[PDB]
């Protein structure tokens, strides 16, 4: 609210990935450590992508407040924003969701016992059902 002046340095287009690479300059007096998701709105007004079509990470503020530096990456489309982008950040900005995985005990405890069986696991399951308990 004090001439936040979101500026860029080192703008490079990478058209084989169809993207613009840049940094996020900000001078923000008496408003410190600005945001993440608010800035993806204002960064649209150089390419008019969307409200949510720009990837960005960084924003380490510098000693004293007032300024920060991030590293942002804007593509053309959301349909391009599923293809060459940080998937954890695709989880982050509301694009993707939680993806469930076994905690690494019960992945390696899932597949070890399944390694020491041989069939698909109903031949012997009939035999235990036939004998003990017989």
């Amino acid at each position: 609210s004090d001439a936040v002046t979101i500026r860029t340095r080192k703008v490079i287009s990478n058209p084989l990935l169809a993207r613009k690479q840049f940094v996020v300059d900000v001078l923000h007096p008496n408003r410190a450590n600005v945001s993440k998701d608010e800035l993806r709105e204002k960064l649209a007004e150089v390419y008019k992508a969307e409200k949510d079509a720009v990837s960005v990470f960084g924003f380490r503020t510098q000693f004293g407040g007032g300024k920060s530096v991030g590293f942002g990456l804007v593509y053309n489309s959301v349909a391009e924003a599923k293809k060459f982008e940080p998937t954890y950040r695709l989880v982050r900005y509301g694009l993707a969701e939680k993806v469930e995985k076994a905690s690494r005990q019960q992945r390696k405890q899932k597949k070890n016992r399944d390694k020491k069986i041989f069939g698909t696991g109903k031949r012997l399951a009939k035999k235990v059902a036939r004998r003990n308990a017989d």
């Binding site: 990478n14 058209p15 084989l16 990935l17 690479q21 990456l73 293809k83 060459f84 940080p86």
Partner: protein
């Protein structure tokens, strides 16, 4: 011991890669070499060391699989493919056609070419002899062996090749008065163009080498590599121009070329 070691780690690397140590890890191991030794260049170092487009290793993995980046007309659709000497690199749309040459200090370049001249290599022929079914065979820098050459090129020349068929087009000789672009040693690649050579027979052989700076220095024969006659040059010559001008004046000219 027991089999080929496929893991090397950084701080064992061929330092002309210029990889730091705070990431400092298992290095990108090259694939099996197409051309020559581990003085080569993998792909996934080059895309995020000096060309500076790749960010994540999965993202540069998400480039070469879609037949995007092309080398020698081919694509070489696996990841850590090595790079020879004066290798052409055909790019995609926006047409940033590249070429590797080495600087005055052994490091590479940030070099870009046009599609003109981007259809031939220069290969260090080293083993030309005749094989079975009577054919004389020739070898190249990349080992792209080519059938039925022009007989009597010589040994240890360079040839202008096709890179769509085998078909060397124009050879060149190697005598007193050429232009030489050496690679290998502390002082690789200024130019020397000749001043003398000798016999030295059996141990090595030496080539006396002198640029326009007019100091002369001596280099063993396996490193020298001509790219033309006096005032020839075949290729798009880089911007450091191959001089290795000395330690003080480069600081003195950067004291001047920044325009204070």
């Amino acid at each position: 011991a027991r089999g080929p070691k496929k893991h090397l780690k950084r701080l064992a690397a061929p330092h002309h890669w210029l990889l730091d140590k705070l990431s400092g890890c298992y290095a990108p191991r090259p694939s099996a070499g197409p051309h020559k030794l581990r003085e080569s260049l993998p792909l996934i170092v080059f895309l995020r060391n000096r060309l500076k487009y790749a960010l994540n290793g999965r993202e540069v993995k998400a480039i070469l699989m879609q037949r995007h980046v092309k080398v020698d007309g081919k694509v070489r659709t696996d990841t850590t493919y090595p790079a020879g000497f004066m290798d052409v690199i055909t790019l995609d749309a926006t047409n940033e056609n590249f070429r590797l040459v080495y600087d005055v200090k052994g490091r590479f370049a940030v070099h870009r070419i046009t599609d003109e001249e981007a259809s031939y290599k220069l290969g260090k022929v080293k083993k030309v002899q005749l094989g079975k079914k009577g054919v004389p065979y020739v070898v190249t820098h990349d080992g792209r062996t080519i059938r039925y050459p022009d007989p009597n090129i010589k040994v240890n020349d360079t040839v202008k090749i096709d890179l769509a068929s085998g078909k060397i087009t124009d050879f060149i000789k190697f005598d007193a008065g050429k232009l030489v672009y050496v690679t290998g040693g502390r002082n690789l690649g200024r130019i020397g163009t000749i001043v003398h050579k000798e016999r030295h027979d059996g141990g090595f052989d030496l080539v006396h080498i002198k640029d326009s700076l007019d100091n002369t220095f001596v280099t063993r024969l396996n490193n020298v590599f001509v790219i033309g006659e006096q005032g020839k040059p075949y290729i798009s010559l880089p911007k450091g121009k191959g001089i290795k001008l000395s330690i003080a004046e480069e600081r003195d000219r950067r004291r001047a070329q920044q325009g204070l």
